[PDB]
Amino acid sequence: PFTDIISAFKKWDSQVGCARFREKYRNGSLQEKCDGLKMEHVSVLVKGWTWIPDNLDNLYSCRCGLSCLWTKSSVLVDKPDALLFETTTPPLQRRSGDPLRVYMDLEAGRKRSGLEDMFISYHAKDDVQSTYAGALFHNGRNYQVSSYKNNDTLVYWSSSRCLPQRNRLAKNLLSLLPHHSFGKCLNNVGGPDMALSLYPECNNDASPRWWDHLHCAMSHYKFVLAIENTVTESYVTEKLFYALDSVSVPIYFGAPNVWDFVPPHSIIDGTKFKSLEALASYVKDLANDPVAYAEYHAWRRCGVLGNYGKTRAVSLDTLPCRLCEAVSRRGGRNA
Amino acid sequence: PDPFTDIISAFKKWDSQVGCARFREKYSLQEDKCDGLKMEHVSVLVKGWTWIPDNLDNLYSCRCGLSCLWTKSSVLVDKPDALLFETTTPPLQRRSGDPLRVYMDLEAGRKRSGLEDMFISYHAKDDVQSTYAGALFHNGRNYQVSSYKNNDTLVYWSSSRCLPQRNRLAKNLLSLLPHHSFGKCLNNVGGPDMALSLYPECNNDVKPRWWDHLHCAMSHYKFVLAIENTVTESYVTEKLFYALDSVSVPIYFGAPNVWDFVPPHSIIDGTKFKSLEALASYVKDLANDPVAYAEYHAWRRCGVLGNYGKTRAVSLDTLPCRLCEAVSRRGGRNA
Ligand SMILES: *[C@@H]1O[C@H](CO)[C@@H](O)[C@H](O)[C@H]1NC(C)=O
């Protein structure tokens, strides 16, 4: 029933070793030359948004000598090459010589507005993909990662939009695993903001906010329960990725193609078990096996990312440049 | 002779009278082959620092299929390939199999510790360059850019570490130009914290920090005075770049090779005038000529960055990837 994560890493190094890991894991769902770029500089004005962060605003330097000015200020860009509308209605029509219309929605469904020339979603088969494996949204958080895992409680969970089926699965699974549930749904920790009470070191000096201490709180738990609000192709949100960011193993119920997005041996796919009891038994055995637990961090410690590298390459953090690149290939205002 | 205040009107007048085509007709940094990469994944642990921000921490996806895990947490990286020390003393010795020792200092002088295997500075001839033209350092700021320039007051300046030569230059120049001086040195606004008194819209809605409103305040002024604390080769700091970020023309006293870093016709180099009175006369004449003033923004509006693109390409924002690539070419721990 270990609590020292670094000791577990060392024991795994002694018994298994990264060389064995690399051989055992030496054996499409993501968007992957400087010949089509018609514009050496592209400007993007974020005209409408609901959540798009200010911390995306920048004059980025992209590949192929492309410059990309992304801003919400019409003074910085008064004649943009493209307008981005995130969950906002684009113009009804586009005449040639008007800026390109870009619509963006990362919620499940790939709901195009029908008034865009380009669509941004989480899916690779749309115009520009933006995955959730990024650091720019919710930037300015607490970055502490605990060196001690909880001895009794193994599972973290937080949900505040209590959906019937998700809550049903959560109740059934959490009845078999000692857990802390900090959200409004199925709370077993008491009040509404107990995460900062148990772990005062996770407080953000700048703030509060629900996300400023999420990673730090998760880092204390060996497992994080991650259940998406919608089961559909390529819809993998921060519920998984933040756990990977916080040295915690996610127990995942979500997109069927999740293994195209995550590193090898990094998550516990709940859909791959015959029963919830078998899942809980596996989790309880992992909580008492430091070597087998550290196998789930060997992807990070040994640098075997598998498909995770490609996933983070097309996240929100790189969205401006790639969007600018596409705008450059289309001629911008001359499309 | 128009003492203009509408910056966009000046932009449109310049567009009609001058145009981007005529502008394009009229007109050291580290640049970069994917085979020397001996490591497909590199980890960097920031072991010592004084100012390096937490929000640089991320698992970056870089060029040539390289992954780069940059963090301050020994839990995220317990066996780093490289240790970074920013203005802190590295280990006295390095044995093979130890992480590479990286020392970093962006202050003028390129002063090393003598105990590093890699040196990061602002200069291109050191191991890895990090210019000041980045957006990540003070990410949490106000992004409003004023559409109105001041009619009477033409120059913004702020300095609070009063250096003799800089203060003499500032006193002589600012006696000839209507100006607002907000720092402790040569204050003419009535005391400290006066910027938020004049421009309440520049408030950052997070705890109030000193840097939250510099760009927004500068956007109200046609010109920003930027005098470096040291005149030396390639030492161009944010005193210039923030003015470029807030649509204000900087009057620059600094590095002799500054024109290798900035866009064409983007700054006023004060050393290129016979006297400070001639400089003040040129600035006063420019403040009443909206077309000639907007020529100084044509670099941004027409997407002609010149050398500015490369400068931003090697700023702090891209430092993790570039450092990781350099470590990968050297073999990391096996050097
Ligand atoms: C301010 O602008 C007004 C209107 O253009 C003008 O009459 C006045 O002379 C200006 N004052 C200064 C100090 O520039």
XYZ file of N, CA, C and O and ligand atoms in Angstrom, chain B residues 2-3 5 151-152 288, ligand 1:
38
model
N -2.213 67.503 -38.585
C -3.364 66.947 -37.881
C -2.920 66.292 -36.578
O -2.353 65.189 -36.611
N -3.166 66.909 -35.412
C -2.856 66.240 -34.140
C -3.845 65.123 -33.848
O -4.645 65.200 -32.910
N -6.079 61.694 -33.179
C -6.327 60.790 -32.066
C -6.914 59.457 -32.501
O -6.794 58.479 -31.753
N -3.889 63.251 -27.619
C -3.772 64.447 -28.443
C -2.563 65.286 -28.049
O -1.738 65.648 -28.896
N -2.434 65.569 -26.757
C -1.367 66.398 -26.206
C -0.140 65.587 -25.793
O 0.972 65.849 -26.262
N 1.837 64.846 -35.649
C 0.825 65.626 -36.347
C 0.672 65.203 -37.802
O 0.063 65.934 -38.591
C -6.756 68.417 -29.431
O -7.588 68.130 -30.549
C -8.457 69.225 -30.866
C -9.389 68.744 -31.955
O -8.677 68.238 -33.075
C -7.627 70.443 -31.270
O -8.506 71.546 -31.476
C -6.607 70.794 -30.190
O -5.724 71.807 -30.659
C -5.804 69.559 -29.779
N -4.930 69.872 -28.658
C -3.652 69.478 -28.589
C -2.902 69.894 -27.358
O -3.127 68.817 -29.478
